Every structure is written in C-alpha cells, then in structure tokens.
Amino acid sequence: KKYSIGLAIGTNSVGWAVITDEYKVPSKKFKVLGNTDRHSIKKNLIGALLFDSGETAEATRLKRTARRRYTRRKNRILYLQEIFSNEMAKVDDSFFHRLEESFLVEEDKKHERHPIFGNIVDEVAYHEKYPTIYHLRKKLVDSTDKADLRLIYLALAHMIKFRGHFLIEGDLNPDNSDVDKLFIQLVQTYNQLFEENPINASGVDAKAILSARLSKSRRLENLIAQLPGEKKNGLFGNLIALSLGLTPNFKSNFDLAEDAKLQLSKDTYDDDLDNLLAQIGDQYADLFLAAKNLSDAILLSDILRKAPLSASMIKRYDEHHQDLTLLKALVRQQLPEKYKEIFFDQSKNGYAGYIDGGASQEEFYKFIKPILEKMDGTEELLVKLNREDLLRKQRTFDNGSIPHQIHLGELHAILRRQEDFYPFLKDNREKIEKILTFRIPYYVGPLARGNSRFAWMTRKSEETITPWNFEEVVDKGASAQSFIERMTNFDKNLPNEKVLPKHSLLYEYFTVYNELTKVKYVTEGMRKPAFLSGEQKKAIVDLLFKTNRKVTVKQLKEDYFKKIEEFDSVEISGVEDRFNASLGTYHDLLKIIKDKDFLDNEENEDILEDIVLTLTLFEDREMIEERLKTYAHLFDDKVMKQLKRRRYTGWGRLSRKLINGIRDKQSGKTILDFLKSDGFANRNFMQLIHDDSLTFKEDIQKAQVDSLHEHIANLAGSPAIKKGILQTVKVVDELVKVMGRHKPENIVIEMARENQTKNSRERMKRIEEGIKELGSENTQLQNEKLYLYYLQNGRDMYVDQELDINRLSDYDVDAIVPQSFLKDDSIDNKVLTRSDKNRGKSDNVPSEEVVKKMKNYWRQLLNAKLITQRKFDNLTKAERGGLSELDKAGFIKRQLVETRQITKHVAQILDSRMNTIREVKVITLKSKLVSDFRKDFQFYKVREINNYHHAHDAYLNAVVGTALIKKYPKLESEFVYGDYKVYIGKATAKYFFYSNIMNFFKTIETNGETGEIVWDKGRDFATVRKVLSMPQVNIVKKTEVQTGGFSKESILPKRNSDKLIARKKDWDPKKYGGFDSPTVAYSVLVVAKVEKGKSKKLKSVKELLGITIMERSSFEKNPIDFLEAKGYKEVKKDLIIKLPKYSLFELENGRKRMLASAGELQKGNELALPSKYVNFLYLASHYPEDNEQKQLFVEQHKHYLDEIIEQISEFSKRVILADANLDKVLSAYNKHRDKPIREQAENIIHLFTLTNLGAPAAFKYFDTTIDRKRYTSTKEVLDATLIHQSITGLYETRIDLSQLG
RNA sequence: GGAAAUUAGGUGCGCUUGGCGUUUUAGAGCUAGAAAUAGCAAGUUAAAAUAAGGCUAGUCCGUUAUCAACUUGAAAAAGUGGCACCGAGUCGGUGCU
DNA sequence: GCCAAGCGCACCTAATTTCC
C-alpha cells in the first residue's frame, strides 16, 4: 500500500498524520509493554508532539561573562591587598580580616564589629568626618598631611573595585576644563585659517549649550543655530561634533575622494588624523588640536563640576542635605499631616522608601512631585526635580559615563601625596596603577590552562599571568592569530583550504575576470554579439581597472572601444551602468607604495598576498610591524608608516588553491587562467567547476570527505525552530518503522512563521544623520506616519510638495509593492503620501510618470540613508519595466510555496534520508493553502479547544499537497537538491496560481491528466470531515529534564522559616536571608522505609522525591548514598524510577495527569468536541453577502450555547475535578444568557482554559473572572499507571505503580 | 534547487568591559514612661556576596543544545513491537496468522 | 534581575549581473 505523511512544524509542536490513497487515516493495533494487563491497543496514525521552546545561548553567555568579571574584580582587590600586606600588619594586624568578615552578624563575626578601626569611638568619628568615601578620596588627593594607611587603602580599593569604563583610549588633560576658553580658542584658530569666512562667537553660550543634558546631535544643532549661515555638515560643524564625541566625516569638507572619519575616543585616531593631515595639509594640525582640547572640557563639565569627581560627589551630598533640610521645614510648616508618611513609611514612595524602602529615584520623584506643587517656596526644588538633580545619591545608575582615567587621576594623586611618608607606595606607583588600568584584550580571551572549551590563548611561559607580566607570559600573537583562524570559513570546494581575505589581490582579480569574461559587445562591423578575448580582457584591466577604482559601461565605451580600438558605435551586454567587481586593493597599495612596476609584476604575487593577509588578520600596529619585518628592504620609512595604518576586514568565499590554483590535467591551466583566456568558450567559474571536459569537477569532489544533531545545530536560525526540526526527523523515522520500513509516497511539510518580539534611539540616529546630510523626542518615533514624515523630510514621496505636520491622520500610508502581491507591511515597503491615487495604477509598482518626476528626490533620501537601497529599487521598479505579468504570477506562487531557507534545510534533510533513485517526494507548502481550504469548506480551526488542530493541519497538508501534485503534475513544489536541470502564457500562469489550483476542489468528480481519479466531491469531503471528527489523536508532551538556574535570582531578606536556600554553606538564611523556589530537575519514585519518630522504628513508604538542579550532580553520582542521607533506608534500587517533567499517569475513568514537579500535577486529557460545535463557535465569534448571510442563519438557528456547556461540564466532572470552579462557571454562564450570541460565544471560548491540556490558568467570563485551581497533591500518582510514550505515542510501555507498594 | 559578485539591512555565536539592583553588617539614636506607645533626631556611605560549589587550582569551570521505556555500542548512535475489515466520546469490536 | 559599551566571525534576506 502507498501511504503519505503530512507534517506541521511549529516552535512548540510537530503535527503528523499518515494518509492513504482514499485520503483516510489508517488504524493499527500496537504492542503494549510493561507489567500491566494491557498487551495491545488501537490507535489512529495521526498525532502531535508538544514541547517547551528551545532557548538561545545568550542568557548562558551573559552569566558566563559576569562570573569571570566578579572573579577578576575580586582579584584586583587581592592584588592590592597583597601589596599592602606587609606594611599593613605593622599598622593593623586584623584590618584586612575585619573587611572580609563585614557581612557576618556580630555573633558569627570573630573580630570586633567595627571594620575600619576596631572601636566604636574611632568608627563613629570617621563617618562623622567622612560621611561618604568621596570625602576621604578628595581629602587624600589635596591634603599633604600623613594619613592612616587604612584610610589610604580603602580610598584606593574603592577606585580599584569600581574603576570606570574604557571607552576612551589614551590620556586626558586635567587642565582643559574651561569649555568657553577652549571654544573661543577653537573659533579663533578657525578664523585664523579662514579670514574670508570668519565665525562670530560673540553671543554664544557654548558652556550652557555644549554641556546641556540633551544628546550630542541635539547639542550640535543648538550651537550651530546660534551661528548665522553656518551648516551642521560644514567644516566647523564637524569640528564641534568631533568635540561632542560623534563621528563626523570630513570627506566632503575637503573635497576628498575617500572617507576621512575621525573619532577622538578611538585608539586609531592619532593615526587617522595623521592620515588625514597628510592629504589636507598640516595647516589644519592645530585646528584638530583645538577641537581635541574642547572635547576634554566637554567631557568633564558633563559628569562633574585636584579631585573633580569626588568634590562633585561631595557637593551633591551637601546639596542633598540642604534640600532635605528645606524639604522637612516646608512640610512641618504647611503639610504636617503628611510628614509621617514621607519620612517614616518605607511602604510609600516617599523619602523613607527612597532611602530604606528601595524605591527608585524615578518612583520617588513622581510621588513627591504633587506635594511640592501644592506647597509654596518649593520653586528652587521643582526646578531641580525636573532637571533630575534633587536629593541625589552618589552611587546611581548614570555613573556609567565616568571614564577610568578620572578614577586613575585621583588614585595617582593620592599615591603621590603619601609617597614620602610611606616607602613602598613610591615603588608600587606604576604597579598599583596598572591594576586599575589593565584590561584583558578581547582577542586574547580567558587565561586558561587548557581546561576551558572557550579558550584559545597560548602562553609563552608556565608562570601565573598577572597584570604586570601579562605581555611576558602571554603570546599576544598566536592568541590574536588563533582568534581569527578559529572562526574563518573554509572553502566548501576545498574543505581543508582556508578561505582568502576579502581584499586579496588574487580575489579581486578573480571577481573582475569572472564578470569580464561574460560581457558582450556589438560594433557596426559585426552582425552578431561576441565575447571579449584574452587580449581584450588584458587591455581593459590594464587601462581601466588599474587606472580607476570603478569602471562604468560609458568608460568601457568611450575610453576603450572608441578611444583605443577606434569604434564609434558600441553596445555592451552582461553589465549594467557600472561593473560590480573592482580592483580596490590594487589602487590602495598603489597610492601607498608608489611603485606601479612592482605591483604589475606577477613575480611578487606571494609577497603582496602575505601583506594583505596580515593587514586583514591583525589590527594592532605593533603586531603589524613584527609581521612585516621581512619587507623592510623593499619599502622606505614613509611607505611603511602608510601601510601599517591600512588594515582590512572581511573574508572571501573561495580559497587560494581553488582560484589560482589547481590546474586542469590536459590544459595545465588554473581557473583564473581560464577566466583570462578561454578562446570562444569564455567559461565562467560556475561553468569551469561543473565542466566534465575539465578535471576541476573531479578534483573538487575528491577533496570533499557528521551526526544529525550536530548538522542541525550548525544551521542558522532560532534554536526554537531548530528544535522542532530534529523532532520532525525522529517522528518521520519512527513512522517509517510503523509502516514496516516502507518509504512514504509523499511528505508534505508546513512550517509556521515565527513571531516578532533602544529602538527609538536607533530610529532617532538614522533621522539625525539623514537630516544633516540634507541640510534641513525619541519615543514619538513609534508611530509609522510620524516616523515616515521625518524619513521623507516632511515631503510627499509621490509628489514634490511639503506635507502638513498636523494632518498626518488625513494623509495616506501606501505600500510600494501592493498588499495583494507581497505580504510586506514594513517601512521598507511603506510610503507616506497625500493620496492613494497619486501612485498611478492601484495594481502595480508606482507609475513611470511619478518615477520620472521623483527619482531625484528619492536618490537624495537614498544618499542620506533615509530609505533602504531595496526600497529605492522598488520605488523605481517601473523604470526597468515594472511588475511583469509573470512577476505577478511569481508573487502568487511564493504565497503558496515556502521560500525560507530554514524550511529548505528540513526538506533537504528528509530528502537525504528517504531517497537512497527518487522514491520519496518532499513537498513544502505555506499555511495559506490549508487555511483557505478550512475557510472555503468550513473546516474551521479553533485553537483554544484542544491540541488536535496541530494534527489536523498536518492531515490537511498531506491531503491538499498530494491532490494538487496528482491533479496538476508540477515540480515547483517538490524539493529538489543538486539535480537541477538547467533549461508569454504568463497571463494564464498568473490566473493558474490565483484561483484554478483551489478551484478543482470546488463544485463533480475531478480527474488527473491521464485518466486518474484525484478528488471525489461525493465521498472525499465526508472522509475529511470524518477524520477531523475522530476522538482519538496521539498527543504527546515531550518529557524533559529541567536544567538551568538553581532558583529565582532574587535574594530575599532573613526569615524564621527554613524554606529559604543558603547563599553560602556557612550563611544561614535566618540571619542572612537567601533564595526561594528551588528548581526541580526531575522527580524520583522512592520505595523504602523511613524512621517513624520518636519510636526509632521503621515504616515502609512509597514517596515521590524531587531532585533539584543543585542536588542533581550529587544524586546521579551515588543515588543510594544520597537517598540514605535524607532519611531513606531499605531502598529498593530497582524501583528507583526517573520521572522528568510531563511524565504521564492514567487513573480512574481515563483521567490523566502530568508531573509539573514532585508536588504539583497538570491536566492530561483533551476535550474532543464534535465538528458541529466547532464550526458554530467560530462563526458566532466572528459574527459575499449572499454567502455570509446564510452562515448567519445557521448561527441564529442553532441553540448550541446550552449544549457546549454540557460538553465542558461532563468533561470537567469526569476529569478536571474542579468542583468549586465549575459551579462558578455555570452560575456566571446563565447570568449572561441575555447577552447576544457573539458576546456569549466569544466568552465560551475562554472557558476551555478549564479543559485545556497542561498547566491550569485563570480565565474570565465577561466581568466575572476565575482564579486558577492547581493540583497541589501528587499522592494520586503513586497508585496510578505510569505511561512511557514513544515520540509518536504509538508505542507505549505502561507501569502499574500500585503493585510497587 | 544551488554558486560568485555588488549594495545594504538583520540575526546569532564568542570574547573583553562599565554602571545599577539585591542581601547581612558597620555608621553609639535621644527624651518621657513600669512597659506597650508618643514626641522628636536621623537618612545620601562602605565592606562582602552575587548561582551552591568544583577540580585539573587556571586571574579556569559552573544556567545553551541533547534526553520515553527496554536491549545493545568507547562513542556517534544503532537496534526491539503481525495484517486487513467494520464502526467511533479519547479508541472499541470482528476476522486472518 | 536590569541597563550600557566594544571587537571578530558566521549566517539570512533582498533586490541586480553572470552561471550550474
């Protein structure tokens, strides 16, 4: 018999069904294993596998990094404590000890409870003189008096432990603090360079503008606005932006050919500036210096106002005191009835909650704001609140802007002050400072000893790596090299050959000749088009591609064919407007080394290939020098300086051994040789690789030498969908064994599209960058119309006119490619215009009329990067011919056939495992075909009822899939791999996919092309309806061992209960608090004896123990010792059953339960509603007129509202066993019986949350809501029937646990 | 179906790094009462931990993927369950071997 | 439990040119 298999792949489900020629679902008796009275059972060959989602590795990685950083932060302190160890023991012997015990309660604390000095008197005095750490810091920076070494350590430790960011490479100058004096100095040096066009900085408040709390882009706009006739994209405008921390491009300001982007924070700025000044002149040298100095002043004034930061923290502390003192007074005098709630009540978001409650600054401001407004004399207070500078703490969320240089400055100062009084401080100055400054390079990674699967570093020595001897022990080279070599692709054609750099000389030679060998030309003398020749190819490369970075068709026509070969009229094919491939690297090195004869000499191909490789591999200037030491004799000093800066990025798709190369046997030529000259053939790369006349094909296939899991894991795509793919393959494989190892006829796959789950800042940056290129709040950009308004510079996209910023609601949002052809609603296919009719045709790409008029305006937006390249091409698609009638057909075809790559991988895998010439055909459809089939023939789907619809979708897929391929034999739907046979009527093709493909279903007996019965409207319709009416479907919930975090991450306060988890072994929760809610990995059946106190006797028990994630490693190593440690003796090891989550149990009257944990159960049954009630619920919930009115009649005619309630009731009273809940359901039901059917049926659907398989959840009926009732007892399970299910659920082993007492 | 180039967007994997949060303790609360309770004073900071912990002791590892049961394999993983027919409230019945 | 910065590599999507 010939059977077919349908598949519905989701992120949490795999639907599957087996189907015969009559479109029916087979039945089979399956063997039942175990110790039960059941030996066989009848099951339909249809079902669904449900599972929890696959997770990404992101959360695991973030925590992995955080673990390393906590370890390394602690080490930094230890490094500092080591240096202080000797001299501290003389001053205080237990100081360091009191620090590492500070967390302990006074009882547990071995030493005296005062960490700093060890007595109450000195300790109180300290906090009295130094309320904050910044008071001490600022003190030690300025004062020249000998200070306590303990106070010196804590000041330095505080700097080390919280050292600030590393976003700014290099030092900053403390002297540059005056924003105005440096601004004027910046303007003056500008006017010195440009007397013809001076800048008046008379009435500009630079400090108020540049140090404003607004964005860099906003502050840039503010300052330029005060300057008449000055542009933001202007030279001075770009100088300000550089000073603000932005990255401007001076390429336009100096009419340069290449980019000249500068950023002061970047480590390569000094070289990029020297690169720029080399071209524009050293007359702008002290101009960028003046801009540099200004940025030093802007940076300081923003985050602070000899120890600027600490002093700024002190001022904040002082003003906090002032404003608090005033705040209490105004309350005592005006609102005394609110004083208790504000300053004593932690529960409220007042000052009390702000200090001791845990309320945030934002929550505190919102609460105290109306209070301030009600009172008077709060004018100076509310202005601070709106400026977010009212009653601020020192340690807050915005301290992240503080560079490490500033903490370093204070640290450096303190060490200098006490360098004389304390000896070892003078020697460890560079040493202590290094602890603060040292940052492990990203290209080095973890400093492992070969025990880390993430590490790649290689050491020079066996010594312990420290911040001081890092370069001595660590080989930066082999570490940085390995960093890139471990990620770079290998050639697919030559699996053992590493791929070439993207900017390789040979590579660009390849790309150019590959394109060049396929262009054609027609002159007046020839009647037929011809390929270029070897001599012609060599000339063009010599004269065009080596004399210009890019080559246009016009350049090919004029500069070559007309100028060199004396041809007036020439027409070029195989290339449009300009060549895609180019020789960029060649022109780069040409400008650098200034030796053309050296470059054109193929004798130095290996040399230049080695240079580009090292420039692509390494970024560090010091690493470049060591890798270019062999070429010191070839280039002068100035040449090497320009070559070290030239660093490339990116890697190609082909290896060197492949391109030039393996030689063909007879010809002796490499692939590149063929691309240079191939007589009349001019075969391109794809033709050479597949040519059986050549030996490239054989050499490649002989070069190619993996588990299914690993292959799937390596595929791109979400781990959620990849998980479903693996289970799909297992379902199919088991189904084959079910069908006696016989392959199916067809496999029809339907894969659901996944869901769409900082953005305003991303959108705001693309606007600011676009406006500045045109010379024209963040949360507001959420709206599509407003966002497009700025994207279109307040102008129409179809008409040359300005749009009103108010009547946005009165204007239209249009789609470039009509919604009928493509299902795209993104901004890449969206346009804000005044009218729909201004686009021209309503069934096509915007007319050539509006294209010819708006082409320029669009290009301006394109060059301003306000619109995508793709969006541009779609806007002007009518210029190239517009949407063809075949294109219209293609868009309809691609609505039925899946296009996604990840789906093609599933089809490819199943095609490789089934066909071993082609026995099985793999078909991949979209959900549209089945969905329309359900809507057309009233096979309505209601997901909230049960999970059967997953199996239904799979069933309907195989039906529609195999019937369409039988009725109309075409293979644009069936998957083919590597066996592609390269080889009007579109009006019919468009009409074909538009209707006729589903029409042969509509109505009597449809036949195939050669007398083959395909669809019988008399019987096959009832067959499908019968299938969807089957009460038995194999629904399997994939049982899984829970992994991940030990518990919830929230550390709870101390409590008297013993439910809390200890954060450390010695930290009892009663005194220190801890975690709650431990996560259970899996449960274990335990049949043993337990001591029944206090008789010291034994009583045999049968219990369910939950093995938590934390305990799992301990348990699995030695379970019997583990169980004995918890009070379980006389343990029957043979009765230890592993019970992961979702383990299935059957009880009385067929009710099933699944394990959610060792103490909670879930509902294990499905409510199989008849199809009649299903269609009624769909229609009544959704409320051609001649066709829609008739369906409204049956809706009105039927009284099913009372019958569905009876269905749920019978199910609930039998299986759900929720007495109190169900009674509230029935009472609230008839309560709203007066409400219309649409309002009734829509709430009836909500009621199925009561009967849904899985975890109990709350559901509401109108205004009446119902709390969820979960099963908090697992005692029932112990005397029930455990059911081990295979992935399909067809093969099951059931264990009667009642015989294990 | 697949490959290369050109433009761009987007997603992931890995590394390096900053700032919060949380938890315990330190920062002597005072006065009036026999005490529960009132009147006030005060609050901004720090230490330490930040999965338990582990060994190979590294400035390393510690939350992804994968997992029914029963037989096998170092492993990857591979093996193990008779077929039609008639019905349908979760699968049942009848018949063949 | 959250927010933020930087670097590299790989992949997918989406139109053009040339091919298998």
DSSP one-letter string for A1034-1102 = EEEE--B---S-SB-SPPBPP-SSS-SEESSSS--HHHH-EE--BPEEEEEEEEEEEEETTTTEEEEEE
Q: Identify which of A578, A504, A620, A577 has the alpha carbon closest to the alpha carbon of residue A169.
A: A620
| Inter-residue contact A1176 to A1123 (CB < 8 Å) | no
Q: How many angstroms separate the CA atoms of A1056 and A996, rounded?
A: 74
3-state secondary structure of A805: coil
Residue A326 CB lies within 7 Å of the nucleic strand B:
no
CB neighbours of residue A717 within 10 Å: 15
In a domain, A528, yes or no: yes
Strand partners, A1284: A1293
- CB < 7 Å to strand B — which of 501-530 in chain A? 502, 511, 514-515
CB neighbours of residue A719 within 10 Å: 14
Quick one: DSSP state of residue A980? -
Q: Identify which of A1125, A1132, A1050, A1150 has the alpha carbon closest to the alpha carbon of residue A1087.
A: A1132
- CB < 7 Å to strand B — which of 1039-1078 in chain A? 1039-1041, 1043-1047, 1049-1054, 1062-1066, 1071-1073
- CB < 7 Å to strand B — which of 899-918 in chain A? 899, 901, 904
Residue A65 CB lies within 7 Å of the nucleic strand B:
yes
Residues 6 or more apart in contact with residue A839 via CB below 8 angstroms = A798, A814, A833, A846, A847, A850
Distances (CA, A) of A912 to A493, A731, A777, A905: 20, 16, 55, 11
Burial class (CB within 10 angstroms; exposed 0-12, middle 13-18, buried 19+) of A1201: middle
Q: Identify which of A549, A546, A557, A559 has the alpha carbon closest to the alpha carbon of residue A519.
A: A557
A614 and A676: one domain? Answer: yes
3-state secondary structure of A534: helix
Q: Residue A819: give the domain boundaries.
A: 766-866
A138 and A210: one domain? Answer: no
**DSSP H or E stretch at residue A1153:** strand A1152-1155
Within A304-360, residue ranges assigned H as helices are: 308-334, 339-343, 351-352
CB neighbours of residue A860 within 10 Å: 14
Sequence-separated contacts (24+) of A1259-1266 with Cβ below 8 Å: A1261/A1225, A1261/A1228, A1261/A1229, A1261/A1232, A1262/A1228, A1262/A1232, A1262/A1235, A1264/A1224, A1264/A1228, A1264/A1231, A1266/A1221, A1266/A1224, A1266/A1225
Quick one: DSSP state of residue A604? G
| Inter-residue contact A372 to A390 (CB < 8 Å) | no
A513 and A646: one domain? Answer: yes
| Inter-residue contact A209 to A219 (CB < 8 Å) | yes
Chain centroid, CA A1033 distance in Å: 37
Q: How many angstroms separate the CA atoms of A410 and A939, rounded?
A: 75
Q: Identify which of A517, A519, A489 has the alpha carbon closest to the alpha carbon of residue A501.
A: A489
N-terminal to C-terminal alpha carbon distance within chain A: 48
The tokens of A156 are what? 């330095």
Q: What is the experimental method?
A: X-ray
CB neighbours of residue A1263 within 10 Å: 8
Quick one: DSSP state of residue A1246? G
HSE, side-chain direction, 13 A CA sphere, residue A687? 12
In the sheet that A1161-1163 helps form, which strands lie side by side, from edge to edge? A40-44, A27-34, A1292-1296, A1281-1285, A1144-1146, A1152-1155, A1161-1163
Q: How many angstroms separate the CA atoms of A767 and A773, rounded?
A: 10
Closest nucleotide C1' to the C-alpha of A1167: B90
A407 and A345: one domain? Answer: no
In a domain, A104, yes or no: yes
| Inter-residue contact A313 to A132 (CB < 8 Å) | yes
Beta-strand relationship, A1034-1037 and A46-50: parallel
DSSP labels for A700-742? HHTT----HHHHHHHSSS-HHHHHHHHHHHHHHHHHHHHTTTP
The tokens of A512 are what? 């150019």
A385 and A410: one domain? Answer: no
A336 and A363: one domain? Answer: yes
- The type of residue at A911 is D
Distances (CA, A) of A808 to A491, A786, A790: 53, 7, 12
3-state secondary structure of A6: strand
A346 and A390: one domain? Answer: yes
Domain end, chosen from A353, A371, A396, is at A396
DSSP labels for A388-446? T-SS--SS-TTGGG-BHHHHHHHHHHHHHHTTTTSHHHHHSHHHHHHHHH----TTT--
Chain centroid, CA A697 distance in Å: 39
Residues 6 or more apart in contact with residue A768 via CB below 8 angstroms = A217
Q: How many angstroms separate the CA atoms of A490 and A499, rounded?
A: 5
Q: Identify which of A665, A1106, A963, A1228 has the alpha carbon closest to the alpha carbon of residue A20.
A: A963
Residues 6 or more apart in contact with residue A177 via CB below 8 angstroms = A297, A300, A301, A308
Closest nucleotide C1' to the C-alpha of A501: C9
Closest nucleotide C1' to the C-alpha of A488: C9
Q: How many angstroms separate the CA atoms of A277 and A286, rounded?
A: 11
Q: How many angstroms separate the CA atoms of A923 and A961, rounded?
A: 7
Residue A743 CB lies within 7 Å of the nucleic strand B:
no
DSSP labels for A809-873? TTSEEE-SS-TTT----SGGG-EEES-SGGGS-TTSS--HHHHHHHHHHHHHHHHTTSS-HHHHH
**Resolution for this PDB entry, in angstroms:** 2.5
3-state secondary structure of A1293: strand
Residue A977 CB lies within 7 Å of the nucleic strand B:
yes
| Inter-residue contact A745 to A921 (CB < 8 Å) | yes
In a domain, A1037, yes or no: no
Q: How many angstroms separate the CA atoms of A50 and A12, rounded?
A: 6
A776 and A827: one domain? Answer: yes
Q: Which residues of A624-643 are buried (b: 16+ CB within 10 A; e: fewer)?
A: beebbeebeeebeeeebebb
Closest nucleotide C1' to the C-alpha of A1077: B51
In a domain, A890, yes or no: no
- The type of residue at A989 is A
| Inter-residue contact A905 to A913 (CB < 8 Å) | no
Rounded to whole angstroms, the distance from the CA of residue A167 to the C1' of nucleotide C5 is: 7
Residues 6 or more apart in contact with residue A35 via CB below 8 angstroms = A1295, A1296, A1299
Residue A1165 CB lies within 7 Å of the nucleic strand B:
yes
Q: How many angstroms separate the CA atoms of A1077 and A1159, rounded?
A: 12
**DSSP H or E stretch at residue A959:** helix A948-967
Rounded to whole angstroms, the distance from the CA of residue A1288 to the C1' of nucleotide B89 is: 22
In a domain, A684, yes or no: yes
Q: How many domains does chain A have?
A: 6
Rounded to whole angstroms, the distance from the CA of residue A964 to the C1' of nucleotide B81 is: 35
Q: How many angstroms separate the CA atoms of A578 and A50, rounded?
A: 53
Strand partners, A1266: A1259
The tokens of A306 are what? 């000899």
Q: How many angstroms separate the CA atoms of A1281 and A192, rounded?
A: 93
The packing angle between helices A404-417 and A429-437, to 10°, is 160
User: For chain A, give me the number of helices (H) and strands (E)?
Assistant: 55, 29
In a domain, A468, yes or no: no
List bases, strand B, within 7 Å of protein CB: 1-28, 41-53, 56-70, 76-78, 80-93, 95
Q: How many angstroms separate the CA atoms of A465 and A992, rounded?
A: 71
A221 and A365: one domain? Answer: no
| Inter-residue contact A699 to A690 (CB < 8 Å) | no
| Inter-residue contact A1076 to A1059 (CB < 8 Å) | yes
Q: How many angstroms separate the CA atoms of A891 and A879, rounded?
A: 19
- The type of residue at A453 is R
Place of tokens 């320029």: A856
In a domain, A1300, yes or no: no
What is the total residue count of chain A?
A: 1301
Residue A1110 CB lies within 7 Å of the nucleic strand B:
yes
A529 and A630: one domain? Answer: yes
Chain centroid, CA A283 distance in Å: 46
Closest nucleotide C1' to the C-alpha of A581: B5
Q: What share of chain A is helix, strand, coil (3-state, %, to 5)?
A: 50, 10, 40
- CB < 7 Å to strand B — which of 700-739 in chain A? 707-710, 713, 716, 718-719, 722-723, 726-727, 730, 737
Compute the C-alpha angle A1147/A1150/A1155, nearest 5°.
50
HSE, side-chain direction, 13 A CA sphere, residue A17? 31
What would the 3-class secondary structure string for A1172-1200 be?
Answer: HHHHHHHHHHHCCHHHHCHHHHHHHHCCC
| Inter-residue contact A1267 to A7 (CB < 8 Å) | no
- The type of residue at A1223 is D
The packing angle between helices A133-142 and A308-334, to 10°, is 140
Taking C1' of C13 and every protein CA, the nearest residue is A900
A537 and A648: one domain? Answer: yes
Residue A405: left if φ>0, alpha if ψ -120 to 50, beta else—which one?
alpha
Rounded to whole angstroms, the distance from the CA of residue A716 to the C1' of nucleotide C13 is: 13
Strand partners, A1146: A1152, A1281
Domain end, chosen from A659, A678, A701, is at A701
- The type of residue at A993 is F
List bases, strand C, within 7 Å of protein CB: 1, 3-20
Q: Identify which of A1152, A1269, A1291, A1274 has the alpha carbon closest to the alpha carbon of residue A1219.
A: A1269
Place of tokens 């769409």: A756
Domain end, chosen from A701, A719, A750, is at A701
Rounded to whole angstroms, the distance from the CA of residue A687 to the C1' of nucleotide B60 is: 52
In a domain, A1055, yes or no: no
Residue A115 CB lies within 7 Å of the nucleic strand B:
yes
Place of tokens 């491009």: A249
Residues 6 or more apart in contact with residue A909 via CB below 8 angstroms = A708, A711, A712, A725, A729
Within A1232-1293, residue ranges assigned H as helices are: 1237-1244
Q: How many angstroms separate the CA atoms of A572 and A519, rounded?
A: 7
Query: For residue A1085, which phi and psi values (nearest 5 degrees)?
Result: -75, 125
Cis peptide before A229 (omega within 30 of 0): no
| Inter-residue contact A853 to A879 (CB < 8 Å) | no
Q: Which residues of A655-680 are buried (b: 16+ CB within 10 A; e: fewer)?
A: bbbbbbbbebeeeebbbbbbbbbbee
Radius of gyration, alpha carbons of chain A: 38
The tokens of A967 are what? 């009725």
DSSP E strands: which ranges in A589-716? 651-655
A254 and A322: one domain? Answer: no
| Inter-residue contact A1065 to A1077 (CB < 8 Å) | no
Q: How many angstroms separate the CA atoms of A166 and A531, rounded?
A: 57
**DSSP H or E stretch at residue A1259:** strand A1259-1261
